[PDB]
Design an enzyme around this catalytic site. Structure first.
Site, PDB file in Angstrom:
ATOM      1  N   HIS B  11       0.812  -1.212   0.000  1.00 18.78           N
ATOM      2  CA  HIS B  11       0.000   0.000   0.000  1.00 18.78           C
ATOM      3  C   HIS B  11       0.833   1.242   0.000  1.00 18.78           C
ATOM      4  CE1 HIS B  11       0.258  -1.501   4.258  1.00 18.78           C
ATOM      5  NE2 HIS B  11       0.901  -0.347   4.255  1.00 18.78           N
ATOM      6  N   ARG B  47       3.383   6.794  -5.411  1.00 23.48           N
ATOM      7  CA  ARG B  47       4.381   5.905  -4.888  1.00 23.48           C
ATOM      8  C   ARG B  47       5.007   5.230  -6.107  1.00 23.48           C
ATOM      9  NH1 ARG B  47       1.301   7.653   0.295  1.00 23.48           N
ATOM     10  NH2 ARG B  47       3.297   8.083   1.094  1.00 23.48           N
ATOM     11  N   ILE B  70      -3.144  -8.157   4.626  1.00 24.96           N
ATOM     12  CA  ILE B  70      -3.907  -9.025   5.564  1.00 24.96           C
ATOM     13  C   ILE B  70      -5.366  -9.296   5.190  1.00 24.96           C
ATOM     14  CG2 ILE B  70      -4.615  -9.335   8.080  1.00 24.96           C
ATOM     15  CD1 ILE B  70      -1.545  -9.886   7.347  1.00 24.96           C
ATOM     16  N   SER B  71      -5.949  -8.290   4.530  1.00 21.56           N
ATOM     17  CA  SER B  71      -7.392  -8.422   4.273  1.00 21.56           C
ATOM     18  C   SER B  71      -7.720  -7.906   2.856  1.00 21.56           C
ATOM     19  CB  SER B  71      -8.124  -7.603   5.390  1.00 21.56           C
ATOM     20  OG  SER B  71      -7.875  -6.275   5.112  1.00 21.56           O
ATOM     21  N   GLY B  73      -8.853  -5.297   1.387  1.00 19.74           N
ATOM     22  CA  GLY B  73      -9.145  -3.917   1.374  1.00 19.74           C
ATOM     23  C   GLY B  73      -9.280  -3.374  -0.049  1.00 19.74           C
ATOM     24  N   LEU B  74      -9.563  -2.067  -0.149  1.00 23.34           N
ATOM     25  CA  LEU B  74      -9.824  -1.487  -1.442  1.00 23.34           C
ATOM     26  C   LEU B  74      -8.551  -1.511  -2.278  1.00 23.34           C
ATOM     27  CD1 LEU B  74     -11.981   1.610  -0.475  1.00 23.34           C
ATOM     28  CD2 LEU B  74     -12.686  -0.704  -1.134  1.00 23.34           C
ATOM     29  N   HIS B  75      -7.379  -1.568  -1.672  1.00 21.71           N
ATOM     30  CA  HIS B  75      -6.189  -1.660  -2.520  1.00 21.71           C
ATOM     31  C   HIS B  75      -6.196  -2.955  -3.345  1.00 21.71           C
ATOM     32  CE1 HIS B  75      -4.570   1.157   0.573  1.00 21.71           C
ATOM     33  NE2 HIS B  75      -3.885   1.639  -0.442  1.00 21.71           N
TER      34      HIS B  75
END
EC number: 4.99.1.3
Lengths: 126, 126
Positions: B11, B47, B70-71, B73-75
């Site tokens: 991220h 980035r 880990i989960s 997410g939106l990434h």
């Protein structure tokens, strides 16, 4: 006679799948019998339980607190120790909370098992 | 004749230890010889490199893209596939980018190896 507990500590994400992954590990570890009690907690305001609340509720003699974190972010070096009254910074920390022995462990990110999780996302063994 | 590459995707954190942990995995995997080329990239604006820039630079025939997350997410469900022109959502995704075969793998969070990283923060074997 030591009852041993584990608290797996995350951050403030309230994404539902984050909560489900923390529970997945907690349940797997509970079922293993490796510890007498396994709980999740969050090192973030307005989330429950926080690590101090979880350790108060646990009747174990020694409690290991593992940060489910990839890196040493401020949750690991500042927030989690502040909440438990432990020294800030990196590394393993041994101390007490309300008479209970508590060991704050290192975050998981540098473990060879995270390297192997990365390979297994490709290999998908098991 | 397939050259195989791996891109480990994180991220937008610019914490220095986050960057060092991503490099630690990248280096361990490069040294293993498991792939012909191993790179890190970030699914975040401003980035570098982003996953599209990293795959363009790589001359591999097939490239596996592993979200170090880990989960979901939106990434993982939105940003990383948008950047590669792949379908949003969960799961393994096979496709092409500029003629290269690309497989976006699942995030690492539910792997049994993350369960064992959590235990090894306590046990500290190795």
């Amino acid at each position: 006679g030591m009852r041993r507990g584990l608290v797996i500590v995350g951050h403030g994400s309230q994404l539902n799948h984050y909560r489900e992954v923390m529970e997945l590990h907690r349940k797997r570890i509970e079922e293993s019998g490796a510890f007498d009690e396994v709980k999740i907690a969050f090192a973030a305001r307005k989330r429950r339980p926080m690590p101090d609340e979880a350790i108060r509720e646990m009747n174990c003699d020694i409690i290991y607190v593992v940060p489910l974190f990839i890196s040493y972010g401020l949750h690991v070096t500042e927030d989690l120790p502040d909440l438990l009254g432990f020294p800030r910074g990196r590394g393993i920390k041994e101390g007490e909370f309300e008479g209970k022995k508590v060991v704050i462990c290192e975050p998981i990110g540098e473990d060879y098992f995270v390297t192997y999780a990365i390979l297994n996302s490709v290999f998908r063994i098991g």
